[PDB]
Amino acid sequence: DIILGIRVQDSVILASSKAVTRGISVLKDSDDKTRQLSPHTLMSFAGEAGDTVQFAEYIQANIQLYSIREDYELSPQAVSSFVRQELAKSIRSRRPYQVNVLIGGYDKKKNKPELYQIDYLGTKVELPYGAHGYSYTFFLLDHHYRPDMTTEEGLDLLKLCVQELEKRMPMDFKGVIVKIVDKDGIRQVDD
Amino acid sequence: SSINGGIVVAMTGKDCVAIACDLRLGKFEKIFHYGHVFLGITGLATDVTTLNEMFRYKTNLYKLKEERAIEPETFTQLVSSSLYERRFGPYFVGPVVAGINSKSGKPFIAGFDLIGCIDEAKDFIVSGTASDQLFGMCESLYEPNLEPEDLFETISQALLNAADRDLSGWGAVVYIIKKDEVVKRYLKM
Amino acid sequence: QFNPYGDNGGTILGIAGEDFAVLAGDTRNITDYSINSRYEPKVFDCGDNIVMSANGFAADGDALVKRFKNSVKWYHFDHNDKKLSINSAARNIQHLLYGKRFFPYYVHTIIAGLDEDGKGAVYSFDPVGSYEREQCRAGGAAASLIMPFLDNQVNFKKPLKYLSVEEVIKLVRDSFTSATERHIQVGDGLEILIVTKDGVRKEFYELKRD
Amino acid sequence: MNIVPQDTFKSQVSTDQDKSVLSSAVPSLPDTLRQQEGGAVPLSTQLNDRHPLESTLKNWETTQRQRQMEQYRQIFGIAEPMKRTMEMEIVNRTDFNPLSTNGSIHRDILLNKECSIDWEDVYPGTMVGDDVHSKIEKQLGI
Amino acid sequence: MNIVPQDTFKSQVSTDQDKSVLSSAVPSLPDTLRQQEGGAVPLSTQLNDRHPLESTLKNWETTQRQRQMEQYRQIFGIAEPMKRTMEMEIVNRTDFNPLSTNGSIHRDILLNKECSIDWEDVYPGSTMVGDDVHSKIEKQLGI
Amino acid sequence: AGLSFDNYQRNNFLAENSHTQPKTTIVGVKFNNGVVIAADTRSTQGPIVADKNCAKLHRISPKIWCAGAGTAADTEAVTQLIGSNIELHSLYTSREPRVVSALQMLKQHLFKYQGHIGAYLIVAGVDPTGSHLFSIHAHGSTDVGYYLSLGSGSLAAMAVLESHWKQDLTKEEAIKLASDAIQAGIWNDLGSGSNVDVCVMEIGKDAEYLRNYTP
Amino acid sequence: TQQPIVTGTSVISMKYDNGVIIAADNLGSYGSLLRFNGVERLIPVGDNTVVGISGDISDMQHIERLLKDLVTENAYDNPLADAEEALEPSYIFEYLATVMYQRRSKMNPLWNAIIVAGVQSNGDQFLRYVNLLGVTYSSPTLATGFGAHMANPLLRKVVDRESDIPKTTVQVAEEAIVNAMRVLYYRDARSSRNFSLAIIDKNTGLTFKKNLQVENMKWDFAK
Amino acid sequence: MQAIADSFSVLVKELQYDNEQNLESDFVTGASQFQRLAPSLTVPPIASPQQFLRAHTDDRNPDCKIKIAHGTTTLAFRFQGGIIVAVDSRATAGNWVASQTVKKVIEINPFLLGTMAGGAADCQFWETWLGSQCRLHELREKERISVAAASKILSNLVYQYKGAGLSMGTMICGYTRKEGPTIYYVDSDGTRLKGDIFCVGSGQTFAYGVLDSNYKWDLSVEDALYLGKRSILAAASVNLYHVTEDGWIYHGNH
Amino acid sequence: LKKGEVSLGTSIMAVTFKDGVILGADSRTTTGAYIANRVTDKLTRVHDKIWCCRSGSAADTQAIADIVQYHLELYTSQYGTPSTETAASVFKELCYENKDNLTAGIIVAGYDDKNKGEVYTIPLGGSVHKLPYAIAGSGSTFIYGYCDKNFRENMSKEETVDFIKHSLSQAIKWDGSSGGVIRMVVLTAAGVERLIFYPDEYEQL
Amino acid sequence: LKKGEVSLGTSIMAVTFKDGVILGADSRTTTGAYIANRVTDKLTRVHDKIWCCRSGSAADTQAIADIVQYHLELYTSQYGTPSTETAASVFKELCYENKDNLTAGIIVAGYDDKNKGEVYTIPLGGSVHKLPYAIAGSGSTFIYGYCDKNFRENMSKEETVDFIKHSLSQAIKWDGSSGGVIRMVVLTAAGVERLIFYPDEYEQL
Amino acid sequence: EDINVESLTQSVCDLALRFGEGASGEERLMSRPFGVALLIAGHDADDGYQLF
């Protein structure tokens, strides 16, 4: 499981890979590593099977309940804080499980994109970049990142990261699903 | 390239013996002879090859000195002492010796543990990984004082029944040994 | 740390006939080298023409048989003395075994009786409840000696269907005699329960070592 | 006559062992949303890797109370533990304060803890639940 | 006055500890071809994972004889161990039979093993290099 | 030279990597003019009876006999080696071998190997000094007894011996007592069964070896 | 408990033609120290049943308390407690076996081995064994511990099968039990010379003999 | 107050029969143990039940060992009007004779099927339980349960016991009017994957390759059955199932 | 000790008295709880009037005693009767130099014309201690007080015999590894005297 | 036994005599080889004429003794002076019901006008034994013989005092964990008497 | 197996008893008796077609 997040001047771009659980030949067309928390907030997760999906769906249900109750959408910051609280609460009385979360949103009130990363212990960091899974990409991102990048330039940088990563993957790296969150909502890039 | 394990069965007849081993059909056979004495070894393949080479060496020297072929009992004692020499580093093998004495004409079979303890049997010897299922089949099928054709049929049926109960390229090699003639047969299942 | 399990070393065999069933077992109870008793039955009549055996750790088997008999008593109480069929008993035993999934009974269980068409039926259970209907099942020590003996003289594919009850009893006795000769844990007696439309009949035969 | 609490481990488990939080869609399964525990806490994880002193601390006062009741039964008779238990049950049942968690004054007097403090006193201590109606339903059994 | 052999481990190691198979090209390194051990046997591998009884069995007879010599020195004097060692040295030195490994009759008479058999006797215990008379001549003469 | 230690590391490595290395009632009774040794005749490879008629009474010398338990190959090898040494010593001294000499040889050989040779023995015999019975442990300790038992059925045999032993026993009484102890081991122990083998060594006579004395 | 501390060794019992005989020695050993002499390990429950217990002594005293409570509860409030409503050996054994298995399943076993011996109301002999695992069995001869390996082969000489029971008198059975106790005192390092015996006969009732000593010991074959 | 008096009035404690659960499990008060929709599972009352179970499940009698489902190849796919489920019926012999042929696929309903691929007892028991749950749901809602709901029920149940010792990998295959034909895969780790083609077995790469070589949505029923049989034969006689909106149909060796 | 080895759970006493020394022991050998030998002779003769008793590993003590007897025969062929001190020194050297591989403890009792009877003890480790009287073994721990209250110097033969009998009877009573008969050897100027007492004698003391 | 805890290594004696009972002990508390308390009163009173001494874990035995004293005060408020058997039963119940979590051993001595002086011992495990006299602790093992040879029924007060003094002096002499002064309590019909004996007195015995 | 119609009817009646003590001794579950009557129609192999 590999997740990448890049925040640009006007949007957030999230890339995620497929599962391939354990020696099971699966042909399917879906994204099982992404849950839409709200029309302008998306969540990507990578970690242990079973636990991570349960946690993601629990978070999605809570946020949908809030949206129905208040007839209003939480900001990405509040969503990320709630996710951090729930993650720290889950391992309160059990052995921690491997999980890493990237939350990408677009604050309509502030009119700006935001990206957060939360690790398995419950550490939330606001970042312009982000990656989890395979362990070089940080050096390339540091070398080729500007806070005022457009969406096309961010997509090109993501393509460069994908091309660099593919040369070390064992040739089983299928199509990486890429989604964009911006003022118009959430969409999926065909390419 | 994986040839470890296997099964070897030895039975006594009226004035004959039968010794049979499993095979992979399709050059690694687990039955060797040093004149009129036959040896079948199961277990680690490297140890099987090493023991075959060592016993060919020792029996060639024995025949050069004695100017006569070695008898099954003397070969059994030799195998026992050779296995006991490696007391703390033993080969991972189960050997079985079969033959007919050239002078008295009495048939002889025996089995060994990995450090050379002798089990001299009058009916049959089973060596292999399981040695519990084929053992029961041989116990149900064996009858004493069989003619060579009856003994061949019995041992072949035991091997076939073992093969059926737990494959694809399974084969068998059978030796019917009389005082004057030795017949080697293949079973292709 | 305390070890709650043990091993008592028995041998059981169940055979389904055309219109009868047979469940037999050796009657020796041992503790790993010593003979606790030379006559300790392990095949029990449970009512409604059902015979049961749980071989392995003796305490677990006794507990399972006790629980099944009490459940059958309540089944008669709550359903107007309805006869419990063999498949329903098999399902009850599956639930009883799987109820201890995380602390299992250390037993192998065989039950025998007649199905709703009057034909013989034998069910075998894995220690945590997995079960199936079989024509013939040997369990415990010396099963690897008993099954080939039966297969040498019966075509399960004289065909087993046309065998009579006396012939089956003789064949079981012969297989157990051979196993007693070849195995150190088998002997001292054999007990056979036969289920037919007339009920359950008991037979006993002395084996070696008295 | 127990000093350290005993028999604290569970002997059976089931997916409906918590009657308070059960799914209405599938009544045999628990309701993960209304549990509000992080959403990734199966019951099995609660059966292993606990601190050895936790069960001793959680059941300590109940064990001492039971030993006192047993001594009263041995020395005084059935009536004394019966009366003590009746008093405590009446006091506990007539109290319903959904906005507070503190024990009553009369409960402290009955427990002989009017001038005693423990760490439970110093340290008495969502999207769904934690409201008055949930406490009403739990208290009334409806 | 030992019974079980003691002080059997090596207190130090070196790459030229075996003076017999030293390389001619690099005298401080051993000659792996003439060792004829298999070609992949570093000396360090011989310092670990040994059977705990191998050292006891290898040095048993020497330990018993050393205890016997110590007893003679304590009870008889220096002359008795001196003479026993001198006899054994004379017998061992004047025997050079490169084609056989069996011990001499006189050595067994001195060792009081005339009618005694051990597994060393029963099991006395091919190559391209160093299986010739000349290697034994060089080792015996210190050439 | 001697027993080899080659492939010890290889065998340990195979054991660590999931490679399974492949893998009795005896009594001795003294009577007024000799000693009897008796044994069961069942040989098992685990729970399976390999042989129903197995000879377990072994001859160190014509009038010195022994039986063993533990590792079978070790027992046979040690008995044969000590027999060879005893025969050579007898030829050297031109005298009948003594049981104490065999006891010393066995004790020192077993002590040399520090218990790694798993041989547990009962050794009985008669020599020009009289009749002797000894028990020998693997680690090198030996003991003297008027009646001894060995094997997995040794407790039942010892109970029978404690029930019916006296200072002054005739040859027939001793033979019956030893046979009864072996029979108790046969009936009450799963490791013992089949027939009984007896050997009677009387002072001044040839050793009498009765195989299958009671079937 | 989780490990025994003070223990008793062995109980041996046999069936004869009209009843049962049971016996056990009087010793509570503290490791290798023979600490307590005078421990009664045969508990008579009524006039038709004797229970012999080996193993942990504190658990044995707990079992004695359970048996006393059972007897007292039998008479609450049946006026026929001494009459046909008296406790049977089978009732006592069923209760004890249920307790032992339940405590084994609780991972808190009673570290004991128990033999129940007696005569049923119809004259039948009852002889049963249950241990800390809850394993139960019956046989014409029963023993625990070292006796199970030494006393049993002797007693099976007298009573080898069920057909030998009618041929065995009380004198022969008592002699066999006494000889087995002597053998145990010979070959058991945790044994005692003093022992108690109990005979339950369908005609004469219960005879409980205390302070019995092993006698006629052969030590003269020193050299 | 009288109940309080009874609690303090003086055998039952040692039997542990003052607890209602112990009475129910031993069928003292009635057959309520056989009346629980959610079955009760016994756990060792110790600090480390999981270590206990793992240690005691890997130690002598072949007949007292937990039976493991066959690791033989299992295939499932959805072509145009149903689901083809294919297994190899080469049963493994032992110390028994079967009265009839065994089946590697569990028939949960006339409309639902599952595969074992794990521990045999776990799969059989919990898929029978799932059939009961689906029946109760269909009675309540007066409509056939969706395959997503059934797979979710099974996944939630197995996740509640995650790490306890269960082992099971099943493929839930169904066909409903609203969903169409659907296949899910549920594992004892809590995984729940929706898919079009699933191949789980000893050799499944060969079958997956054969499928991918000649897979299309326009396959016919006979063509789909032939393709499934050929894929199983390539993997390693062959039991086939065709699932349609009206239920499943079984083919012996078609 | 080595796994599976035979241990020596004995009760050993050695008492010096006016005319010499007396060495006594019980006769039980155990393998845990089973008595493998009801009647074992624990009094080992190393020379004509130099005897010993052993504790620890049985095989190691037997090997050490055999070597010491060989040594004393070699000494006797040269210089004659050895002193008890010399035998104690040889025992001590053998036990100390091999204490990393062999477990052995010895009680040595001797008589000679010069020193008129002596007792030495060599506990585990190999140190030597010369004492007026010594006790050793598993049962000895139960009679440390009693002996300390009942020993006098220059007792008569009968008094010493009674003292040893009482002490060993208590040691047998309390220790489970101590057994049936009491064997004693009296070493004086007259010679070597062997005594044995049976349970029916000492159990009524 | 939890790591880092305090253990009661001691020498405890209780002897019944003609007029009543006497309980005696030493006064040493050690942590490892360091004497943490040179002067300790080990004679614990649970009722006016019912005293005890403790062994095992100090904290566990202190808690058990406090509960027993509370229980006996309740009993006295209800029914009057309890018997020694009742106190022994309460001690046994407390020790047995908690034996999986606490390590406690108790010696109980008592007097009443009905039973006239009694001794009970509850070793580790929770079993109870009634004896004419009892010894416990690490230093008791060295006086098993001596006591068994010197106890008589119905001894006078002075004879009992001398017997206890001698036995505890030997136990002090041989046991490292024991030492200091000897303390004794005499329970008769005339009341409770306290006695203390100093090392310069008993070491000369 | 299918449950008998009479067994199901008995179970429903045992539930209806719950305004007082239960059939197996259970505590009261509801505050008042039900206000409904049921006609239960079934078929089983033991008793054919039944109406309760």
Tab-separated table of N, CA and C in Angstrom, chain H residues 60-95:
chain	number	residue	atom	x	y	z
H	60	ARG	N	-1.096	-34.630	18.785
H	60	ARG	CA	-0.348	-35.800	18.342
H	60	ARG	C	-1.229	-36.726	17.512
H	61	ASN	N	-2.449	-36.942	17.983
H	61	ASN	CA	-3.358	-37.854	17.303
H	61	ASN	C	-3.873	-37.215	16.018
H	62	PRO	N	-3.713	-37.870	14.865
H	62	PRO	CA	-4.229	-37.288	13.616
H	62	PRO	C	-5.730	-37.060	13.630
H	63	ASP	N	-6.486	-37.895	14.342
H	63	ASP	CA	-7.933	-37.745	14.408
H	63	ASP	C	-8.377	-36.686	15.406
H	64	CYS	N	-7.483	-36.221	16.275
H	64	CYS	CA	-7.783	-35.144	17.205
H	64	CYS	C	-7.223	-33.805	16.744
H	65	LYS	N	-6.759	-33.716	15.502
H	65	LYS	CA	-6.283	-32.460	14.946
H	65	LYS	C	-7.409	-31.747	14.209
H	66	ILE	N	-7.340	-30.417	14.204
H	66	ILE	CA	-8.380	-29.609	13.578
H	66	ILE	C	-8.301	-29.785	12.068
H	67	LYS	N	-9.406	-30.217	11.468
H	67	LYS	CA	-9.436	-30.470	10.035
H	67	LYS	C	-9.286	-29.171	9.256
H	68	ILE	N	-8.447	-29.209	8.226
H	68	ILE	CA	-8.151	-28.054	7.389
H	68	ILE	C	-8.770	-28.290	6.020
H	69	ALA	N	-9.470	-27.284	5.503
H	69	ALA	CA	-10.098	-27.414	4.197
H	69	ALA	C	-9.038	-27.577	3.115
H	70	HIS	N	-9.430	-28.233	2.026
H	70	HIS	CA	-8.498	-28.509	0.943
H	70	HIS	C	-7.986	-27.214	0.325
H	71	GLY	N	-6.684	-27.176	0.058
H	71	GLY	CA	-6.067	-26.026	-0.570
H	71	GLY	C	-6.151	-26.106	-2.078
H	72	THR	N	-7.026	-26.981	-2.566
H	72	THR	CA	-7.202	-27.176	-3.994
H	72	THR	C	-7.782	-25.922	-4.643
H	73	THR	N	-7.588	-25.825	-5.956
H	73	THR	CA	-7.937	-24.617	-6.688
H	73	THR	C	-9.445	-24.394	-6.704
H	74	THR	N	-9.842	-23.143	-6.482
H	74	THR	CA	-11.229	-22.708	-6.540
H	74	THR	C	-11.295	-21.456	-7.401
H	75	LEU	N	-12.295	-21.389	-8.276
H	75	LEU	CA	-12.410	-20.328	-9.264
H	75	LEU	C	-13.820	-19.762	-9.244
H	76	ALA	N	-13.939	-18.458	-9.483
H	76	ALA	CA	-15.248	-17.834	-9.597
H	76	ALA	C	-15.151	-16.619	-10.505
H	77	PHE	N	-16.137	-16.460	-11.385
H	77	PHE	CA	-16.188	-15.266	-12.222
H	77	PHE	C	-17.627	-15.016	-12.649
H	78	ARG	N	-17.846	-13.859	-13.273
H	78	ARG	CA	-19.176	-13.402	-13.661
H	78	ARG	C	-19.129	-12.918	-15.102
H	79	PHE	N	-19.836	-13.613	-15.997
H	79	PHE	CA	-19.665	-13.342	-17.420
H	79	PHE	C	-20.704	-12.388	-18.011
H	80	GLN	N	-21.969	-12.808	-18.122
H	80	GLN	CA	-23.019	-11.903	-18.586
H	80	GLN	C	-24.359	-12.065	-17.883
H	81	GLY	N	-24.683	-13.238	-17.350
H	81	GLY	CA	-26.005	-13.486	-16.815
H	81	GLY	C	-25.971	-14.367	-15.588
H	82	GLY	N	-24.854	-14.339	-14.874
H	82	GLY	CA	-24.713	-15.153	-13.687
H	82	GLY	C	-23.254	-15.272	-13.297
H	83	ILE	N	-22.989	-16.257	-12.446
H	83	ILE	CA	-21.659	-16.509	-11.912
H	83	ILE	C	-21.308	-17.964	-12.174
H	84	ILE	N	-20.101	-18.201	-12.668
H	84	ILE	CA	-19.561	-19.545	-12.804
H	84	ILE	C	-18.611	-19.778	-11.642
H	85	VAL	N	-18.890	-20.817	-10.859
H	85	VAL	CA	-18.045	-21.233	-9.745
H	85	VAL	C	-17.536	-22.631	-10.062
H	86	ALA	N	-16.220	-22.807	-10.041
H	86	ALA	CA	-15.613	-24.059	-10.468
H	86	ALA	C	-14.637	-24.555	-9.414
H	87	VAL	N	-14.757	-25.832	-9.051
H	87	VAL	CA	-13.826	-26.456	-8.123
H	87	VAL	C	-13.387	-27.794	-8.698
H	88	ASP	N	-12.278	-28.307	-8.176
H	88	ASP	CA	-11.804	-29.639	-8.521
H	88	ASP	C	-12.224	-30.609	-7.426
H	89	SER	N	-12.892	-31.691	-7.822
H	89	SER	CA	-13.473	-32.640	-6.884
H	89	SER	C	-12.555	-33.821	-6.599
H	90	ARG	N	-11.249	-33.659	-6.803
H	90	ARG	CA	-10.308	-34.727	-6.493
H	90	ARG	C	-10.121	-34.821	-4.985
H	91	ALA	N	-10.986	-35.586	-4.324
H	91	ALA	CA	-10.935	-35.708	-2.876
H	91	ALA	C	-9.674	-36.446	-2.438
H	92	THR	N	-9.288	-36.214	-1.188
H	92	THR	CA	-8.103	-36.825	-0.602
H	92	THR	C	-8.522	-37.962	0.321
H	93	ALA	N	-7.947	-39.140	0.099
H	93	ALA	CA	-8.310	-40.317	0.871
H	93	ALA	C	-7.616	-40.316	2.228
H	94	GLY	N	-8.188	-41.063	3.156
H	94	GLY	CA	-7.634	-41.213	4.490
H	94	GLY	C	-8.057	-42.541	5.069
H	95	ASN	N	-8.187	-42.587	6.393
H	95	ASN	CA	-8.660	-43.796	7.055
H	95	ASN	C	-10.183	-43.815	7.104
